[PDB]
């Protein structure tokens, strides 16, 4: 599957694509503001994630440190990234069909559109200006908008016992952006894409 990557950000981001425990194909890479990097992802993925790290800096052999989203200061990521994220998600074959949503539980940083560039459905966007309007308490010092779990590290906003319920700050995420997981237990926002679907995730969309 090819997934082209677009920067339409006024700042340069560092793209990242992974799986959890491997990269998807070169796993991240330098786009500045306009830019296009196309990757492609093996058939089957399940649990693919696709972000952008923000304020990054890598020496010649590709380590370093981003200020949103650092996989293990690693440029090209082998491991999901550190919070605030927000997540292009996908599971790909997944007995005939694809399937993608766009989620804020690890907070967000960068808006992004997540559509499919073939036909059969919808694509779904969380653009809103959450950094911007972030509550006082889940802003993140070194930038974006953390999730409530990763601040407060509760049952209730880590969802650990598989019970909980809308609280008032994933009610913000959903109030920002509807068409994102807010919470752990939210009302699936998944689309159904044909299988084997290819797509495209934007930054800065608006």
């Known amino acids: ?33 306009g830019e296009s990097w196309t990757i492609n992802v093996e058939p089957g993925t399940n649990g693919g994630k696709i972000w952008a790290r923000t304020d990054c800096y890598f020496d010649d052999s590709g380590s370093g440190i981003c200020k949103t989203g650092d996989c293990g200061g690693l440029l090209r990521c082998k491991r999901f990234g550190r919070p605030p994220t927000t997540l292009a998600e996908f599971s790909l074959n997944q007995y005939g069909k694809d399937y993608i949503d766009i989620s804020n539980i690890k907070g967000f940083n960068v808006p992004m559109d997540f559509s499919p560039t073939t036909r059969g459905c919808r694509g779904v966007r969380c653009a809103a200006d959450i950094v911007g309007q972030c509550p006082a308490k889940l802003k993140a010092p070194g930038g974006g908008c953390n999730d409530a779990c990763t601040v407060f590290q509760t049952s209730e906003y880590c969802c650990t016992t598989g019970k909980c319920g809308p609280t008032e700050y994933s009610r913000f995420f959903k109030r920002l952006c509807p068409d994102a997981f807010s919470y752990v237990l939210d009302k699936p926002t998944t689309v159904t894409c044909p299988g084997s679907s290819n797509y495209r995730v934007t930054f800065c969309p608006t």
């Open 1 to 33: 599957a090819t997934f082209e990557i677009v920067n339409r950000c006024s700042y340069t981001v560092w793209a990242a694509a992974s799986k959890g425990d491997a990269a998807l194909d070169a796993g991240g890479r330098q786009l500045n503001s």
